[PDB]
Design a protein around this ligand. Structure first.
Ligand SMILES: Nc1ncnc2c1ncn2[C@@H]1O[C@H](CSCC[C@H](N)C(=O)O)[C@@H](O)[C@H]1O
Length: 241
């Protein structure tokens, strides 16, 4: 059954750090394609491969090493998403925090971005992602710095973020979610317990993310700002209600 397959996949070195719900989610969808378990499992592994960033145990090790040496910039360069943001990092957050600087930030599908929030003096951060390796990198650092950061191994398509905050960051995530499950992107934004959010899209290929987002954003949200900074198209939105 699905549970047996989940147990076998989580025992492998390649996927042992993946969120169990993620493995089950993919397994369940593949099982719906009725197949000899052989086939099902193999189709699931093929999908799990590129579910976190196509992100290795080696990259995470290096990240923690650089972090343990106080080299935050180097750690950020060890994760593809934060590395490509390095050049305009401060320009980006000056934009997001221009109006108000949040006391508590929720980083949805955080990757290693929380490290950038630390250097920005953000007091409280809660981040969630599907690879424990990410939390294994940030958590020990936060502890040393006596920084209030918490990591949750959580698949947002299985359980929405339950935490409350002043601002939520949803960087380079909606495209992936929407492709995994239609309508899940806007559903996620509605589930966030924050009055404001910052959403970003990659500029490389919803062929047109701007048209998709502006035309599909639920009525309870209002777009207050839209700007392209570096490799990202960012939207500052307000959730009313
Ligand atoms: N269903 C899901 N739930 C939670 N996180 C997910 C997810 N599917 C993919 N992710 C995570 O989404 C991230 C996309 S890369 C963007 C990382 C970070 N927001 C940044 O901008 O630097 C990856 O870290 C991936 O592991």
């Amino acid at each position: 059954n699905i549970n047996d397959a989940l147990t076998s996949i989580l025992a492998s070195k390649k996927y042992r750090a993946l969120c169990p719900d993620t493995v089950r989610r993919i397994l369940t969808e593949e099982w719906g394609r009725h197949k000899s378990p052989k086939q099902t499992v193999e189709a699931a592994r093929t999908r799990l491969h590129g579910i976190c960033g196509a992100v290795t145990p080696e990259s995470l090790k290096a990240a923690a090493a650089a972090l343990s040496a106080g080299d935050v910039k180097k750690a950020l360069s060890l994760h593809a998403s934060t590395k490509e943001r390095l050049a305009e990092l401060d320009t980006l957050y000056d934009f997001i925090f221009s109006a108000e600087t949040p006391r508590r930030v929720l980083d949805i599908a955080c990757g290693l971005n929380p490290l950038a929030l630390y250097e920005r003096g953000i007091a409280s951060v809660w981040g969630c992602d599907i690879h424990q390796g990410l939390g294994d990198v940030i958590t020990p650092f936060a502890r040393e710095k006596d920084w209030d950061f918490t990591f949750a191994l959580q698949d947002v398509l299985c359980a929405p973020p339950a935490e409350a905050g002043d601002l939520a960051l949803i960087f380079k995530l909606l495209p992936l979610l929407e492709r995994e499950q239609a309508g899940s992107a806007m559903a996620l934004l509605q589930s966030l317990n924050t009055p404001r959010m910052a959403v970003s899209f990659p500029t490389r290929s919803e062929a047109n993310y701007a048209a998709w987002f502006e035309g599909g954003l639920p009525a309870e949200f209002e777009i207050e700002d839209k700007k392209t900074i570096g490799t990202e198209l960012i939207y500052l939105i307000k959730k009313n209600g």
